[model samples]
Target: HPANFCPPAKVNILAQSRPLSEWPINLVSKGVQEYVYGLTAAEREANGDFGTSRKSLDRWFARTGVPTHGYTTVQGLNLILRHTFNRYDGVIKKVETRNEKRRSKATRINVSREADGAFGPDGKLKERPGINPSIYCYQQVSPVPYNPAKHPALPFSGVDPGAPLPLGTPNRLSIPKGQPGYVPEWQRPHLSTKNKRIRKWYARANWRRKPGRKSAIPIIVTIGKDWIVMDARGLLRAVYWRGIASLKELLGFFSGDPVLDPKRGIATFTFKLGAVAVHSRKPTRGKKSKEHVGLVAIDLGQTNPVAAEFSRVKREEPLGQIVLPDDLVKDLTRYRRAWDATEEQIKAEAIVQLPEECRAEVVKVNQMSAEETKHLILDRGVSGDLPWEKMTSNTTFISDHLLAKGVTDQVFFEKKWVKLLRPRLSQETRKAVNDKTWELKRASTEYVRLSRRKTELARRCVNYIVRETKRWTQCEDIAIVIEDLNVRGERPDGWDNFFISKRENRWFIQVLHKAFSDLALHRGLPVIEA
Candidate 1:
């Protein structure tokens, strides 16, 4: 087996700063559609032959048309096109065959329009359209000293703090007067687009002056009402700004590469956000060096449910908790026992009515699912593929012919056989058999309902446990050590039947493990599996 390679980890930063009203979202959605249409039109006109060379694309745009999309920057438009082309390339690469001629014709692009154009098979057009653009910008911080004696320069007229701004104050660094030269454009308080029309769009997030300084502090900028921002105070902000600074530092830093406005001569053009997580290597040093302040260990089971113990050096603090209430378990057991007894009585009633050979078919039908029965009837009747060597009775021949001649196969074969044998038996026995079959089906359904309810209650209990763990660790930095249930070998016999009971109910351990792990990571706490 080939050794798996661990790729460099990445995080996506959503740009939401403020709640966008309906107008803004609709406008952006409409603008995206316009942008996509333009791009698609250009590709169609060129017979799907194109290049993202900035200059060439610019000329092509001039010839193709102008942008009516509400986008503010040419750089933004270029970035959007670069994203589209790259996505198109990736899809084509995956589905295309080695044979070039067949590749174009065999594509799965769906093109629908009272429309003028189309592409490969996968690319399709609907009356509705949308686009997600990868537009990003960068800012660099240079060496600028902060002196306590002199006030910092205020760009665009704002009061200084009377004394020097604190050391590591983001966006406060300026070229000190009477000491050196001009401040770098990037270090200034504001930014502008290439045309510098109104300096419309701006992003909000934290960036460090330099690593090993203070930490990643919130970097805020002001903009006019005309400007539109993407994601402001959404889930992306929650991950980066609200998250621990040390966690961000440990994850790693971005390369100098820009995610927007691809230029020629680079092997790659579009740069965008990568997957998120605080990826770390396992500790490989002395065990003593890895000691935490304390460990909150959790042990799971059915009866006790969840037992959490907090351990410090030698002492231990245990939490007592019950997963399922005694009353609830008692109710389930009572109902299940009653239903099982009723099922036994139904089986006894059925046994006397059914003939020997017909009884065998009844057992087969009982074991087989409704879906399997339907398929079997269809195969025997419609397909004429029944593999029986011979029909030993007149009733059997008639049953097969009736099924083949488009008769509704509603009741089971045993029921039909018993109905034919109805004249031979006492009317009381025939009625008893029918009544028992109905009772059996109803009882089985009720049994399933009880099992599902129990499973649901178990899930609720686990969710509550996870929520409590978060609450307990809210104010402290505690190490959580969960017993590793990672499968190392085949499970013990009867494990699935013991836990699941029926197809509708599954074990809760997997759900518990995932919920705990996800919550711990989101809370910025490390989960150590022992």
Candidate 2:
């Protein structure tokens, strides 16, 4: 039988402050104010909220809306989102019912197997054993219901704006709690889960074997929905310290300062909460208890919109202009220029004082087209004639380039030419595509590996965040909220086929999930990612 399951102790409540640095509200608010200042009554009436006379902005028709967005109002219209998140807790109840039956069956098996054939008449298992059975109901608040298993609201409406829009001002769109347009994610209770494993086992000889001594178990947490899974393996004190530091340091990291509204001699020590972790456990079969330890107010985007949304919303610069470290930039610049210079010199040498074998290669190529020479050389390499020594490399360099000049004085069969070719040839490529069928396999393997690597890297990062957060806060259970990344709109015709590749989509999702699951199990933390 499992021991009485328990939930972790609650630390403190952390609330993300409203004036976020990265949130776009401030910049959007300023824009809204400016727009409103010049607005005529007719314009205001026409473009105001819920105006049938209002025309949708043509520019935003294809892209994320240019006029900004009202996240609450727009997202509220998603009936499907409401349906998906509000899953009936009844499903969990049903699961518990099934589990109860299994528990009872085990109880009966134990009773009947006791000494003296502890069985009732008519082959019935005995009901009572020496030990008493207990049932405990542990409740976990899965905060926001955000499992991808549920129905999705992506493309719910053709006019639905995917990203957050700029409303009029900072306080213009006041979304109240429990309202359709309001997201209660901030107030959503922290997760509370029971660790229900078979904690106690009975010995076959009419006695229960002594169980292992109890030790403090470390709890795990999930970071954000997309990233990797990390463990909270530090001591309790460290966790507390980190939690405090996370509150202060995260603000400082993003340049948000906590100020004191001092009135008395001592500065005002009051602080607001942001994202908080609360602890609750089913202390007894018919009872529940909750405690508040500490709180962490998220001091980033939510508190300062300009820093969060406006800063990031600028047109993305081209990837080529992206700044790289000095060493890497130097290497890249040198590599490209060096390679170009080397090729030009090689071409000049080949044209001016060409070797007999080089002239012969030119003559052979002249007899056939560029592609034909490539195929001929490729055939020689693949047919096991002098090994695949000069295959893809020979093909890429010779066949890929169109010769500028050639003559009839060319010759063939030179050991020096083959030696030079061997130096440039890639051994791996030849072995990889040994056969016609192997070419497709090699390409597919390359794609899968690339995708797997990408997802694995992201997974590791998310895991690290999770572990770091959990270490101080004593939170082991995590609830994840994920964004809908839809590719259907962009590639409806090809999404079905593209989704089949693991790296392109399937494998990426699986890797993210696996990273969290594996880390949670290994670190003794329960993880949940949606």
Candidate 3:
């Protein structure tokens, strides 16, 4: 049997800095982008097909020196390179294909609009339309960095703060002592309250005071032994990882190479090293084996994310569930409101293009409920007696267009003294900072940050469900049945309804489905989506 691997069997948490800056992992990805961009553009420019052969790819690797021979072997490095190339290659091919088609089409077109003279009185070619020229890509250096950050930017072979992948740091050097760097001992400050250390998940907690710390930026690292050196960046430097609970120690190496992911969390940066193809050389099903399984039904949409049912002898009706923290919920609501308000503002601005007479009525229509807005828009946009008789007319059709409606949604009119062309707008004006929008806080990235935070909220819920299931089940087997309540708002888009209601009430609803399903598979439970 092939050796089993769980590349993410354990983890080692590192400090923010090392030597504090000899991280060459950045260079490998950086070089990968450069190589891909150059090779792709050159081929497409000469109207030639672009891609790689086994020989040419190996040549490129040698020229780039991505692995630097410090890693256990070229296996892991090539895998990473191949994956990155596949991603960039897919995108490049599409772009090249579109550009080629556009070039050929342009050849058959004629732009001669001059029927009479250069500047005819009523023949104005000034108002003309032309296609935007196609280019290889929009930006010069849009590097597809290693880790996909919903927002940003590690590996293994050996073990330690001391053992080298090989290292040039103090711990690995001949020096007996060390300069103080951020290590595991120095944890972030916490505010402690005696609720089983629940309030503050910090190393040590204490009641607040200006006396304690006005502001503290502390660092921490993990035990050296937990660190594994499986890979190296350029210069053959040590890049040890602190996570993965595996038989690497006994076997002298991992069964498979872990693809490293560096990401930002609510507060800190976490390095996630994992391999999907890890073999289970030795595996355990703590609860039970696959054949026999305990059945559990899970219902979503309650006070908590996942509430499951498991009946037993003299059952006290143990309700298994988890909640989004009050503070986190508040944050979610705030972001949602801000997003809504921004869109309203942008739409409010776009109405500026509407003529004055229609504009005044449109504002009034927008301020009313959806029914009233639609009624008003239909009243104005429609022309002729008994416009109601023609229900399919564009005027009434748009009004009755049922389903998803954003907060900024409104109707408009167009034609002879009639309204024209629809509009959609969104924005968030942070504040009047000397009559300027804050450059630091643009609303564009606000939604990305919010979605990331929402995912984190669902993550904790699934984990709690798994834990509760384990604790409650006396039986050694388990399978999860996810029950979906058939519910929908007035429209098709809001099929999840209260599960994803009008406001923040819908917060966890959208994600909990995926969260429970995805995490269930991870927890080794078979899932049936009802």
Candidate 4:
């Protein structure tokens, strides 16, 4: 069979972030900022908090003269409007109703802050109680050089700037835009979406208040000779690249946007360098035993954070397992304990300040009889805890699934404790819990970082196994399968769940599986069934 006879692949070639011409970049940046603020004003007007009583996407664009954005056109604005609003929480398309209702927990504003922490549900949230500002509400952005003819301001307005179809021609599937990867013209392979799964987030900038200097927008203009374009936007952007190294084709591929904060000199794209391409082989009718070389199975646990096996290569032995070190393990244990200890102490101090009789009820709830708790456990097959289970189970805050009276009684008391005590809590006592929360965040960030680093190392090791398997089989691709990765259980060392489940704080079991399977994706292997 001739070469082009094979299916054409979408190869992503992400280019490195290069220096931009300041003026043009700033011009686009200014447009983005103006649009962001202008959109905010319009929203306020529509909400009857400010401006014209009535507004529409077309009306806003028509009335609000763009500050500087005539160059790249209105495509960027079109891209974000629909992307943000279509994903609008309720799927209702009306932003006012949803926006107003959502995050309506502003306690310090017309509502009293001193009265806020007065209750548990109200004081339960750690972040300072406030409404998300109108400015941060809409994904106020725009697409360069590609504005649709219809109402661009309308949330569902405009088509994707990229080529869709000619309608008359035979329909085809597969998808590229201004990418970053640069390969010599002789490289033959055409650049496409190296399977950009459209991630929900990326190497992103929040663009909080920091305007002009630290614009979240990637203002690149030049599409150099055979240059790859990168759609580095607010969220879910794509990247590109191309490479062929020793029996393996490695190219750039990531949907993550660039870190476009040029003020701190970080106008760059962070892409996965070695995106493994599918190895072509003869089509298989059934389980072509001869075609299968090895099986990589993943095993996860608290102690052994991430482990995998290649049957043929390692004889079913897990290789290069990423285990949580003993020190960090203990750190997490103590850290988890510190939160409880702090909370218990804070409650004790607050309870002391309460009426003597109220403290008796608190003491009774706190010191539940061992038999009472045991009956509580047996009464409800799945006892409901606030949010989730106890230290031994998932923390599903404020669960309605609770059935047992014993557990429910304690939960009831806990809520009353917050309601009765927190509002009257001294600033010092409240500050103590807030300070503990900040500390937890910092520590969680550290562990999460280590977890991420371990994930990369696991990826590199898994790739080596894949490379070795390919070398051995010479004609077959590896068949990788893994378990249903939601391996939930008790934390190691009898360590229980944290009061608050910071997604980053927990150990990496699910995420490691995600990275492993995603590795198979671009490597062109079917993912988990087990």
Indicate which candidate wins on TM-score. 3
Of 1 and 3, the candidate ranking higher by TM-score: 3
lDDT of 4: 0.38
Off by over 4 Å in 4: 1-60, 64-66, 69-260, 269-291, 301-448, 464-475, 487-506
lDDT of 2 by residue, 346-408 (tens): 444443444454345544433444345346445333232333334332343332221312222
Count backbone overlaps in model 4.
Answer: 33
C-alpha displacement of 503 in model 1, angstroms? 7.6
All candidates' TM-scores?
0.30, 0.16, 0.40, 0.36
lDDT of 3 by residue, 198-302 (tens): 111223544454333222111122111111121112111111332222122222222222222333211112122233322222122232333423455667544
Candidate 2 contains a number of clashing pairs equal to 50
lDDT of each: 0.39, 0.30, 0.38, 0.38
Q: Give the clash count for each candidate.
A: 15, 50, 32, 33
Among these predictions, the greatest lDDT belongs to: 1
- Candidate 2: Cα lDDT at 442: 47
Q: Report model 3's TM-score to 2 decimal places.
A: 0.40
Ranking by TM-score: 3, 4, 1, 2
